[PDB]
Amino acid sequence: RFLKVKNWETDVVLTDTLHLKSTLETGCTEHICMGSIMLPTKDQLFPLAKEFLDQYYSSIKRFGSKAHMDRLEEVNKEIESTSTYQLKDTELIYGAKHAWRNASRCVGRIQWSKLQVFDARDCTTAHGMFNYICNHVKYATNKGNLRSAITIFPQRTDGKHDFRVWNSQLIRYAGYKQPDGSTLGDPANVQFTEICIQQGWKAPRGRFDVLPLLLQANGNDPELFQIPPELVLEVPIRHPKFDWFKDLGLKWYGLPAVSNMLLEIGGLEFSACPFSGWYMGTEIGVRDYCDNSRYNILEEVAKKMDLDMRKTSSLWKDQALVEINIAVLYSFQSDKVTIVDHHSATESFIKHMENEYRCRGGCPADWVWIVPPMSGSITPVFHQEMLNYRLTPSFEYQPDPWNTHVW
Amino acid sequence: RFLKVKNWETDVVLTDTLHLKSTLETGCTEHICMGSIMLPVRTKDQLFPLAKEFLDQYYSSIKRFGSKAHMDRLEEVNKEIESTSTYQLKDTELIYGAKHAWRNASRCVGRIQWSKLQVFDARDCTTAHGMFNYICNHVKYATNKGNLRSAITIFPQRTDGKHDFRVWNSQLIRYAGYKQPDGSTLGDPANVQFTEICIQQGWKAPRGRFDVLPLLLQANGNDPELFQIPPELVLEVPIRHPKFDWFKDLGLKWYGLPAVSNMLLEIGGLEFSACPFSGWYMGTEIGVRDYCDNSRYNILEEVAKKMDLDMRKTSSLWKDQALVEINIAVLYSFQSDKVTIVDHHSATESFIKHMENEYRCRGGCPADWVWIVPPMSGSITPVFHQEMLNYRLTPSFEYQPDPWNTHVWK
Ligand code: HEM
Ligand code: HEM
Ligand SMILES: N=C(NCCC[C@H](N)C(=O)N[C@H]1CN[C@H](C(N)=O)C1)N[N+](=O)[O-]
Ligand SMILES: N=C(NCCC[C@H](N)C(=O)N[C@H]1CN[C@H](C(N)=O)C1)N[N+](=O)[O-]
Ligand SMILES: C[C@H](O)[C@H](O)[C@H]1CNc2nc(N)[nH]c(=O)c2N1
Ligand SMILES: C[C@H](O)[C@H](O)[C@H]1CNc2nc(N)[nH]c(=O)c2N1
Ligand SMILES: [Zn+2]
């Protein structure tokens, strides 16, 4: 059926048909919605490859052409002979860009077409991966003028020769469980921070220690590598009015780079495909700094501001939250490091949504993830009905490597 | 089938079995989620089974399932339906049904209070004047001079669909809205259409910024009638700030009693089209939505100016800063005038405790994440980190089309 999506702030109604092309399951049913759940053969391969190629040739205005038929049959024969196939560079680039385009949880998709794709399919060792990663980090960082990019390592074969980046993000801070029972550094990485130790790393036992890369090539055991400190751009956090802010000793990295997801293109699976863009202010100030299970710094900032913390009704938590986020955006803009505020980011997404509806007939979006973690209703996306569904190519979650690896 | 729900902040995992008793559809499919969509005369046939389900639930609740009383009631109702095409609920069943419709309301964060609902039986009402009296008594009871008490008033159920009882107002108390020929709006933009209907029906509008609308009441399917709610019964709170003396000069105020009056209460197959209910406000409803929505009073700018914030670039978060102070103002004003109100931190914390309790004693708690998470400071409230399952259980409250779109004028 043809579904319609309305914006209750502007009355604008959009009709969605793109969902009719969805193939994967959402996790919901006619009786139950699981919209807030974080994680809901040669015979299988060709139809997938066919699906992909058809849309590829359709995008290049050559659907049903000789070239299309030729390619479709070449891949077909290749699969029947090699149980798999290889994507042309042009197809790989198209696929990576569309996987981003179809990422329902990403609010920054208005940038989808500008993706720089690095073909790392000729890689064979961990030192090789380290080289490709350093180059990606340096390219995307661009002295502070961040550029979107993704590096694609060799596709899956027999499931035993998988390339995998063990880190969840190329750049993250370590976490250590102290005697006090408390946590030093980022609590979210405690476990990983230990697998590094349990592997050889020499943790400076610090609050903000950039973790090392744990690279896995061809299924072998992962190796560690220190990212050239000179390549890891960091920003000191200070408030544009509270001189005492710098005394908190807070800093964060400028390059957000997810490295544990799986890129699926035409049936082929790329288990190591780290990608990076740039931060939206709230990701750091609200989630990394204020989540109770993270650096949880609200009380500290609350105290230094001297606001009544006796009653929650004084909204001291809210007041403190705003100041921390103003500081983050100020520190990044002052160090000339790319970053976008939730107001600007959400405005762009709405524009992107309208473009996608009139050009592709729709745009899968996960409201739960798209609406910012603070000031939700004062951003335009809060009032925008959204339809979530899965389209391929796509980025998927996958089990951690240390829970499936056979040393 | 068992369904696990996890809180990523506490790692506490809960198991849901209650969904197995869900019957109504959600709108979602196995290929698409419609979780963020605002809006996703029965026959004797589909009536007794609906009646049976409810009665079994009721007798099981009082530990009398299978009792002679339980069996006799089923026979009584069956005979009634086949004999008259419908049936009448006993007072006890109505109270149980009303409380559970609230308990099952997936979009309500105030459910920890469900068992404390005061139910007023207005099923003997026959005229609009009759309805007005019942509503006035409800408003006075619930207000209780500022110490708000939850309540619901239930008018006669639907019969053939042509004698419906309806409260045309969306809320018992709301401010009028007026569109100016220059395109601007005086008052609350959200109530312009209804305000026009009221004027056309003869209401003499004072055309101000905060004029309490009159009640438009429909009884027995007849044309609706206008009634002014006694001013002395409408509790209002002047909004001021604890530190900003200029805030009060913004001339802002709001009523203390939120009273939804356009929903349909479904109990055991019976439909009650007029069932106004009220509780008390959570601060953000007024401060964030009624005052700051671009399509409502939209006071962000004026407030940001007076605070002299840097409004040249959004990156200064002047909207966020102004938003917090306005919400501080709302909470402070209500508490000072001793009118019940709850902040979002307290309300969401209570909901989490309610939800965990329900999972243990009931086996589940349907919840709509999109609606439960507050419209400001989302992630610093426990609910943001709580996975929730949304499904429909009956008794329940449902939306129904606006009466002016379906009413046959006499
Ligand atoms: C251009 C700048 C970009 C911005 C402003 C942006 C912003 C966002 C934000 C705010 C989120 C939510 C993060 C979280 O809460 O964990 C997100 C998620 C995501 N983005 Fe983007 N993004 C950008 C670039 C990218 C790129 C380059 C790709 C891939 C090629 C991408 C793929 C995704 C995916 C797959 C998710 C969901 C990840 C998950 O489930 O953890 N994004 N993005
Ligand atoms: C004790 C005070 C109560 C509080 C703090 C509370 C709070 C809330 C809030 C914050 C919402 C969302 C409002 C919106 O964004 O439009 C809501 C919705 C709702 N509540 Fe409660 N509530 C309370 C009492 C009640 C009562 C007495 C009932 C019924 C007997 C009830 C039934 C519902 C329903 C059905 C909805 C959804 C209405 C809609 O879809 O517009 N609530 N409540
Ligand atoms: N802006 C981002 N954001 C995505 C990565 C940063 C994000 N703030 C983060 O820490 N994501 C983690 C933590 N929670 C997610 C999960 N799925 O559990 C992954 N990416 N980009 O390429 O520009
Ligand atoms: N706290 C409430 N809140 C619900 C009523 C107030 C709410 N803020 C409101 O104005 N609801 C309207 C506007 N949006 C809803 C809709 N369905 O479109 C109804 N109720 N209570 O019983 O205590
Ligand atoms: C339980 C709930 O799904 C979870 O807390 C989600 C909510 N929305 C989110 N939205 C974004 N962007 N990022 C997140 O990590 C989350 N967490
Ligand atoms: C489109 C989206 O569903 C809509 O804006 C919803 C979001 N969450 C909400 N949550 C509450 N409590 N109240 C609302 O009116 C809404 N509006
Ligand atoms: Zn759903």
Short mmCIF file of C-alpha atoms and ligand atoms in Angstrom, two decimals, chain A residues 169 256 258 275-279 283 369 397, ligand 3:
data_model
loop_
_atom_site.label_atom_id
_atom_site.label_comp_id
_atom_site.label_asym_id
_atom_site.label_seq_id
_atom_site.Cartn_x
_atom_site.Cartn_y
_atom_site.Cartn_z
CA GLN A 169 35.35 3.24 16.84
CA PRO A 256 33.80 9.97 15.04
CA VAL A 258 32.42 3.63 13.66
CA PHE A 275 33.60 4.98 8.18
CA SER A 276 33.71 8.52 9.50
CA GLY A 277 31.95 11.86 9.13
CA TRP A 278 31.86 14.52 11.83
CA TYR A 279 30.18 15.06 15.17
CA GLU A 283 26.71 13.19 20.83
CA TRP A 369 17.39 7.70 16.92
CA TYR A 397 25.45 -4.68 13.52
N1 LIG C 3 28.51 11.21 14.02
C1 LIG C 3 28.74 9.90 13.93
N2 LIG C 3 28.28 9.15 14.93
C2 LIG C 3 28.34 7.69 15.16
C3 LIG C 3 29.54 7.35 16.08
C4 LIG C 3 29.62 8.25 17.34
C5 LIG C 3 28.52 7.98 18.40
N3 LIG C 3 28.43 9.19 19.23
C6 LIG C 3 28.81 6.73 19.27
O1 LIG C 3 29.57 6.80 20.25
N4 LIG C 3 28.21 5.59 18.89
C7 LIG C 3 28.30 4.25 19.62
C8 LIG C 3 27.70 4.26 21.06
N5 LIG C 3 26.30 3.84 20.85
C9 LIG C 3 26.12 3.15 19.57
C10 LIG C 3 25.49 1.76 19.71
N6 LIG C 3 24.96 1.14 18.67
O2 LIG C 3 25.46 1.16 20.78
C11 LIG C 3 27.51 3.13 18.92
N7 LIG C 3 29.40 9.36 12.90
N8 LIG C 3 29.99 9.92 11.82
O3 LIG C 3 30.59 9.14 11.00
O4 LIG C 3 29.99 11.11 11.60
#
